[PDB]
Amino acid sequence: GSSGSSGNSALRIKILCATYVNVNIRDIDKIYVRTGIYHGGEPLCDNVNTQRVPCSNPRWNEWLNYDIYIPDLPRAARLCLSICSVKGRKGAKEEHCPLAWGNINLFDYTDTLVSGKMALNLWPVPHGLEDLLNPIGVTGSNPNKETPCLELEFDWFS
């Protein structure tokens, strides 16, 4: 048997807020965040999106649940997030535009699921990034300050 540790099956991450967002103009209505996991650029399961918050207050403070399995999560796979801006017109549909993106290695350098709150900078999206989430984006915390940064909470209960 075993004392019983690191016995997680479902991954749950909570978002706090963002800083130095790419929201200059004052037309955007609200914003949202898209998270997901991919293995070598290829998707594994549906992605998750955070509630819609006003640019003025990118604060989320919501618990995001992932449809992934710890004991089924491949080392090659990882977590990828990206900020998007949604804005539409009366009667017309909304428009989503990518701003930044960040890839976090679900498995630390020691093949040990990450934990404890953390806040790293995100990389700027390419010229009008057709897509919203960049699963291919590089991993690590951008040393750049000007760039935005998102804070999340790593928790593993079950």
Side-chain angles (χ1 to χ4, degrees):
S2 179
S3 192
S5 295
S6 73
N8 203 234
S9 302
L11 157 77
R12 75 193 271 83
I13 309 152
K14 172 201 190 176
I15 304 293
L16 269 297
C17 73
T19 170
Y20 317 118
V21 192
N22 210 294
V23 297
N24 291 350
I25 48 90
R26 48 273 150 155
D27 291 296
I28 304 150
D29 193 62
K30 298 270 167 151
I31 40 157
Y32 76 72
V33 177
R34 166 157 291 197
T35 63
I37 296 80
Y38 300 63
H39 181 140
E42 274 205 298
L44 280 72
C45 288
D46 195 37
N47 320 114
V48 187
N49 67 101
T50 64
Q51 61 178 250
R52 269 69 61 171
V53 322
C55 57
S56 190
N57 210 64
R59 209 167 199 165
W60 277 281
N61 317 346
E62 174 80 86
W63 287 85
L64 211 52
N65 52 284
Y66 291 72
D67 267 37
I68 73 92
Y69 223 42
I70 272 68
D72 211 38
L73 211 296
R75 305 294 168 74
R78 59 203 79 192
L79 175 63
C80 31
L81 40 90
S82 66
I83 311 175
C84 310
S85 69
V86 71
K87 162 68 176 201
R89 283 200 201 165
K90 208 192 158 289
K93 288 155 277 288
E94 277 166 285
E95 193 186 40
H96 306 207
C97 208
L99 320 174
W101 53 268
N103 304 66
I104 289 173
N105 302 94
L106 270 170
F107 289 110
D108 271 329
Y109 82 127
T110 54
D111 59 89
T112 300
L113 281 168
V114 288
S115 61
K117 209 174 90 210
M118 168 161 67
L120 57 88
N121 285 73
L122 324 166
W123 305 81
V125 303
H127 276 213
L129 166 76
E130 213 268 30
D131 294 292
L132 304 168
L133 193 61
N134 185 346
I136 314 281
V138 312
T139 51
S141 64
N142 209 29
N144 297 260
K145 312 288 153 76
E146 59 200 291
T147 71
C149 164
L150 269 168
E151 193 157 73
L152 69 304
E153 282 177 17
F154 280 120
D155 274 62
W156 322 73
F157 78 103
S158 89

